[PDB]
């Protein structure tokens, strides 16, 4: 039953797609948190060997437009190409329609692309689960969606993917109160840093952070070392 994509398992599963989703667990941890008005994405960068060139290709979290951010875990090679197709779609939408892509629309497109690469047995499904996030054009509501190799996608207040995901997700489940989500950017960043610290034993050098804000503002931090220290002081 696991030999092909086109055949259901007797209990109703499709073991090949489930194996692909398990392969998504191979990659490094990535997490995203929706604040009241800001979205924070953190990523566990693989511990860099001292011979790696830090000044080039440092970020896994990457941009799909001025107002959308994409993060992922799993097979990096597939992720780059999925991101490329997402960018192509975003600009095609900007061309055919005056308004930019709604984050919901972009995540639907990425889910469709992933699903389409599963419709036939001739192609391997992407071993990746993207964490598209951003703010809808001219709209203040933060949005955060997760995609899976099967094409199933859902919106989350906070979600984790990749290596040792369960530890982070359980921590967020306990510590994230939907009645009072972290409002200010600093609180959301501290929550993200705490969440990743439960998995990344290494210092702050491994934790990358991306903050996306309404009105098409995206910024990546290089000061979370202070945030890491504060959590250390709280620890």
């Amino acid at each position: 039953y696991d030999r092909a994509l086109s055949i259901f398992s007797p209990d109703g599963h499709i073991f090949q797609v489930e194996y692909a989703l398990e392969a998504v667990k191979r990659g490094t941890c990535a997490v995203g948190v929706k604040g009241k008005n800001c979205v924070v994405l953190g990523c566990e960068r693989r511990s860099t060997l001292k011979l790696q060139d830090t000044r080039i290709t440092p970020s896994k979290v990457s941009k799909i437009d001025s107002h959308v951010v994409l993060s992922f875990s799993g097979l990096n090679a597939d992720s780059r190409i999925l991101i490329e197709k997402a960018r192509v779609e975003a600009q095609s939408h900007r061309l055919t329609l005056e308004d930019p892509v709604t984050v919901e629309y972009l995540t639907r497109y990425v889910a469709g692309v992933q699903q389409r690469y599963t419709q036939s047995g001739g192609v391997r499904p992407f071993g990746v689960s993207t964490l598209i996030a951003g703010f809808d054009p001219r709209d203040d509501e933060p949005k955060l969606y997760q995609t899976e190799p099967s094409g199933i996608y859902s919106s989350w207040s906070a979600q984790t993917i990749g290596r040792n995901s369960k530890t982070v997700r359980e921590f967020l489940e306990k510590n994230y109160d939907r009645k009072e989500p972290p409002a200010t950017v600093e609180e959301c960043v501290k929550l993200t840093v705490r969440s990743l610290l439960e998995v990344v034993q290494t210092g702050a050098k491994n934790i990358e952070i991306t903050v996306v804000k309404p009105d098409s503002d995206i910024v990546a931090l290089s000061s979370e070392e202070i945030n890491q220290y504060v959590t250390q002081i709280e620890q």
Binding site: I81, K85, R116, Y117, Q119, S120, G122, V123
Partner: protein
Amino acid sequence: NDRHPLESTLKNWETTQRQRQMEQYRQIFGIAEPMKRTMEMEIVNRTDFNPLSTNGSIHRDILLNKECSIDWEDVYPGDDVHSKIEKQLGI
């Protein structure tokens, strides 16, 4: 009216020529021969996928009996590999 007169006919010359040849063969040699030849052609095209080399299959030349001929369409021959995979599989 805006197109060059030779454009419409020459654009698909090879395929229409092959279709006419198959029609003649069906008239002379019955349904079996066109079936065999078209199935050879389709089983060669279907199995040969290689996006990088647009040059084309050798066996395609062998079966068309143009393994020793040259045409201007041969002298003067979204493009990413993945687009080609999508297009070829129709997925």
